[PDB]
Amino acid sequence: MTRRIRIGGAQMGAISRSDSKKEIVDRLIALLRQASEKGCELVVFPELALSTFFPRWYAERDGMDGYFEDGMPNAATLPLFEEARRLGIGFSLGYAELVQEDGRVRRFNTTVLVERNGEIVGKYRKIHLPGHAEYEPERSHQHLEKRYFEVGNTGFQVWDAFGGRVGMAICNDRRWVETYRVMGLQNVELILIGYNTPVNDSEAETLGMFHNHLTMQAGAYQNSTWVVGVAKAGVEDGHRLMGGSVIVAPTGEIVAQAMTEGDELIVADCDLDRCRYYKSHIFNFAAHRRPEFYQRITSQTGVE
Amino acid sequence: GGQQMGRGSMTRRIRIGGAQMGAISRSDSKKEIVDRLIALLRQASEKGCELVVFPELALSTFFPRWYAERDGMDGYFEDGMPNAATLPLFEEARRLGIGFSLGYAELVQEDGRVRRFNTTVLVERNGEIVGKYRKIHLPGHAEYEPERSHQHLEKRYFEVGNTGFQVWDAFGGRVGMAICNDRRWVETYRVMGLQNVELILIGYNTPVNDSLEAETLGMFHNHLTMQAGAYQNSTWVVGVAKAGVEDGHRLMGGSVIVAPTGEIVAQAMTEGDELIVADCDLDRCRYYKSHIFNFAAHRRPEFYQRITSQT
């Protein structure tokens, strides 16, 4: 029990435009309470867990500020922070961050990581923005996240938290090998990823799920780290979001997986010393990195 | 797939034979080895393959398991490429109109000294050598370590390759190579994806520790890394084992051909000489290069500096 933590993945069901924010927060607390009762010490919530997935709707570039969080915590979210601290449970929470930095207003897709004592460990701002900047008439559903958020300015950080090394990424970050590699090069042992993944109706749903798990399982094994992937899933205002929340061991094995598209808690005991094990041995076999052969990864953006 | 998996000949569709090998023991003659590769090449020709992928170090036993002077394994190295013993393979390939990739131990006079590389060569249908890759990631250790159940002395007999991960215009598309445990490194696939690679050829020798298990985990890991590298760089990946029991040391099987979706389209079923074949539409690589993995539109290199400023 030296560096073991019981982790709950708090998958969420659909949030519609018609849901009250008070009732959204109530659902987060209910999941946080179930996690407490199951002995969890850390709870992972989805990306943008405090609203409907509004990137699917067309509006002015600043016409979505009503979904964003004034502060963190603010009046709407303070009940969740207070319940978590009272229960002695840490969490990571995704939200849409509105902030005044260098005079102007900035918009970030953000996850904040809060420790068992209720102190904010840190904050990751989404690097890889999916979707498009403008209405796309040939699409069945819009994805306009690019139109409403700026590229984050935190980098992929890894913090001393929960007895180990903990990092965060957001949604489609999880398809870029660089996302996990950057944090593995900082000795990450637990990566927390909330996501909203639109599903295209009619199959290719199974291939989407395959790719969802494939990228996280490979990130976990190839950087000898735990990976928690938590969905906001289900049908929001006619738009299906993918389920498939998982907790993944540094072996790349899935050790817990959601079975619904609704609010659902998955639990696993995560031994962080298992990450140290695979990273390096006294009699080991893994060659060392040869970055002199990797320069294209930072010297170009697209293909040659 | 529960259907016939082959597809007829077509522009930009390439039929690939994965030529998995069984064990090569220390007591095998060189002719016996070459004749076995020629047999797989003829098998691949009778199935209409235009490209045959051979394993890493396909011309000898996996000699890194044994201890000798640092120049004491040079007798397993190829003098030239081709040489007197390997010329019949090139002659067969040229005559049948089949290209191939071949792993071997390369002994070369260059820069004034003797250099030793773990190497794969890509040979076009016309018989011409079109590219060479020299293994970058050398696994194992440099000196005899008696606490180990088996030795893995690759760092002792090979130098770090000086080619880089190259991608060539070949076989109607963009072809790259890697070797064995290169395939565990996301950088291997990504560096070639940044060169618009459509087909990565990887031969390998993967020792398996004496089990009973976690043998299924080693197989899971083997396929996980190639499937992910394929999908996340929107490229075909061919991984070809030398497998079986060489002089009491077991080598992993599981050769596969993997589509740019990350799906396995062909898989070996034995641990001997075996041919797997799949028809590979290189245009299928635009499936994810158009949007999901459009590198120019999505990558943010200013946040990846640790990957090139690292160990």
Is the CB of residue B102 less than 8 Å from the CB of residue B93? no
**Tokens at A151, concatenated:** 């590229």
**In whole angstroms, how far apart are CA A253 and each of A226, B91, B219, B229?**
10, 46, 13, 17
Is the CB of residue B155 less than 8 Å from the CB of residue B70? no
Residues B210, B215, B221, B224: is their CA dihedral positive or negative? positive
Partner A contacted by B184 (CB < 8 A) = yes
Partner A contacted by B300 (CB < 8 A) = yes
Q: Which of B222, B214, B212 is nearest to B243 (CA)?
A: B222
Is the CB of residue A116 less than 8 Å from the CB of residue A69? no
CA A87 to chain centre: 22
Phi, psi of B290 (to 5 degrees): -75, -40
Q: CB-based burial of residue A138 (10 Å sphere; 0-12 exposed, 13-18 middle, 19+ buried)?
A: exposed
Residue appearing with tokens 């009503």: A66
Record: contact B224-A218, CB cut-off 8 A? yes
Contacts of A222 in chain B (CB under 8 A): 184-186, 225, 228
Gap between the Cα atoms of B79 and B102, Å rounded:
15
**In whole angstroms, how far apart are CA B97 and each of B37, B45, B47, B51?**
16, 8, 13, 9
Partner B contacted by A204 (CB < 8 A) = no
Superfamily of domain B13-307: Carbon-nitrogen hydrolase (3.60.110.10)
What angle separates helix A78-87 from helix A21-37, to the nearest 10 degrees? Answer: 10
Phi, psi of A139 (to 5 degrees): -85, 150
Task: Find the residue in A nearest to B223 (Cα).
Answer: A218
Is the CB of residue B179 less than 8 Å from the CB of residue B166? no
Is beta strand B113-123 parallel, antiparallel or unpaired with respect to B99-110? antiparallel
**Tokens at A175, concatenated:** 């398809």
Record: contact A294-B140, CB cut-off 8 A? no
Partner A contacted by B223 (CB < 8 A) = no
Gap between the Cα atoms of A36 and A91, Å rounded:
11
Record: contact B301-A303, CB cut-off 8 A? no
Task: Find the residue in B nearest to A214 (Cα).
Answer: B228
- Residues of A tagged active-site: 47, 126, 171
Is the CB of residue A111 less than 8 Å from the CB of residue A93? yes
Gap between the Cα atoms of A134 and B108, Å rounded:
57
In eight-state DSSP terms, residue A12 is B
Phi, psi of B270 (to 5 degrees): -120, 180
Contacts of B196 in chain A (CB under 8 A): 303-304
Is the CB of residue B169 less than 8 Å from the CB of residue B199? no
Partner B contacted by A181 (CB < 8 A) = yes
Gap between the Cα atoms of B39 and B19, Å rounded:
10
Radius of gyration of chain B (CA): 19
Experimental method: X-ray
Who's near B118: CB < 8 A, 6+ residues apart?
B56, B57, B103, B105, B106, B134, B135, B138, B154, B158, B161, B179, B180
Is the CB of residue B131 less than 8 Å from the CB of residue B51? no
Who's near B57: CB < 8 A, 6+ residues apart?
B63, B103, B104, B105, B118, B203, B205, B242
Amino acid letter, B33: I
Query: Which residues is A166 bridged to in the sheet?
Result: A159, A190
Instruction: Tell me if residue B69 is catalytic.
Output: no
Superfamily of domain A4-299: Carbon-nitrogen hydrolase (3.60.110.10)
Return the beta strands (E) in chain B as ranges: 13-20, 51-53, 99-110, 113-123, 129-134, 167-170, 173-179, 199-204, 236-241, 244-246, 249-251, 256-258, 264-267, 274-281
Gap between the Cα atoms of B185 and A287, Å rounded:
10
Partner A contacted by B87 (CB < 8 A) = no
Contacts of B224 in chain A (CB under 8 A): 214, 217-218, 221, 252
Parse chain A into domains and list their residue ranges.
4-299
Q: Which of B237, B221, B196 is nearest to A278 (CA)?
A: B221
State the catalytic residue, choosing from B50, B92, B106, B135.
B135
Element (H, E) at A42: strand A42-44
